[PDB]
Amino acid sequence: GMTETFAFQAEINQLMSLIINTFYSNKEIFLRELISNSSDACDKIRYQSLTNQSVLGDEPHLRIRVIPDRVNKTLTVEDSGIGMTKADLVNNLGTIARSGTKSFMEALEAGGDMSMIGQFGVGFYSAYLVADRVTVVSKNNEDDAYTWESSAGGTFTVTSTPDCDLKRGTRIVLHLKEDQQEYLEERRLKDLIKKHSEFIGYDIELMV
Numbered sequence: 001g002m003t004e005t006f007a008f009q010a011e012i013n014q015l016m017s018l019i020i021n022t023f024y025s026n027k028e029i030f031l032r033e034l035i036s037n038s039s040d041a042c043d044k045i046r047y048q049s050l051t052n053q054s055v056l057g058d059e060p061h062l063r064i065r066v067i068p069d070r071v072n073k074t075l076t077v078e079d080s081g082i083g084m085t086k087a088d089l090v091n092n093l094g095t096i097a098r099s100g101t102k103s104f105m106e107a108l109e110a111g112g113d114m115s116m117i118g119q120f121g122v123g124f125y126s127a128y129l130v131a132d133r134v135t136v137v138s139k140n141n142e143d144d145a146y147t148w149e150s151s152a153g154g155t156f157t158v159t160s161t162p163d164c165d166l167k168r169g170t171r172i173v174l175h176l177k178e179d180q181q182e183y184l185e186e187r188r189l190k191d192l193i194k195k196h197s198e199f200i201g202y203d204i205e206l207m208v
C-alpha cells in the first residue's frame with residue numbers, strides 16, 4: 001500500500017548503531033529476546049480471550065514459530081499473539097522505547113552488559129546483533145496488517161501490506177549478517193530453543 005517513512009529519535013539511533021557495530025561475542029541472546037517478546041504477546045491475547053473468546057477468531061492456537069530460510073539467508077520468529085496496529089508499531093519501536101533505550105545505554109556506560117537489554121524493555125533491538133535488516137509484519141484485531149522495516153540508517157518505514165497467512169500476531173524477519181549464518185542451522189537453533197522452552201508457556205515450533 002502506501003509507504004510512510006519515519007525517523008528514529010537520537011537515543012534509538014545511538015542504540016541501533018551501538019548494537020549493529022558491537023564486538024559483543026555472545027550474539028545468540030537475540031533469540032531469547034525475540035521469543036520472550038512473542039511469549040508476552042501471546043499472554044496479551046490470551047488475557048483478552050478469557051473475557052471474550054471471540055478475540056481469538058480464526059486463530060485459536062497461541063504458539064511461537066522459528067523459521068530458518070537458507071535460500072534467502074533469513075531467520076524468522078513469528079507468533080500468533082495480540083499483534084500491533086500501525087500506531088502500535090511506531091509507539092513500540094519508536095516512542096515508548098526511548099526511556100528504556102536511554103537507561104540501557106547508561107547501564108552499559110556504568111559497567112552493565114548487553115545481555116541485560118531485556119531488563120530495559122528494548123530487547124527487540126538485539127536483533128541487530130545478527131541482522132543488517134529487520135522486518136516486522138504485524139496484525140492486530142483492530143487494524144489492517146502493517147509492515148515495519150529498518151536497516152538502522154536513522155529511519156524506518158511503515159507500510160500497509162495485506163497478508164492472509166498472518167491472521168493475528170507478529171512475524172519478525174531477520175536478514176542475517178554475512179558472518180552470522182550459524183543461526184540458519186537446524187542444530188544451533190534446536191539447542192537454543194531447548195534452553196528456554198520449558199520456561200515459555202507456549203509451543204515453540206522449529207520449522208526445518
Ligand SMILES: CCNC(=O)c1cc2c(-c3cc(OCCN(CC)CC)c(Cl)cc3Cl)nc(N)nc2s1
Pocket residue numbers: 037038041044079081082083084085088091092093096097121122123124125136140170
Ligand atoms: C497490543 C499492542 N501490541 C504490542 O505492544 C506488541 C508488541 C510486540 C512485540 C514487540 C515488543 C517491543 O517492546 C516490548 C516492550 N515495550 C512495552 C513497554 C516497550 C516498547 C518491541 Cl520494542 C518490539 C516488538 Cl516487535 N513483539 C512481538 N512479537 N509481539 C508484540 S505485540
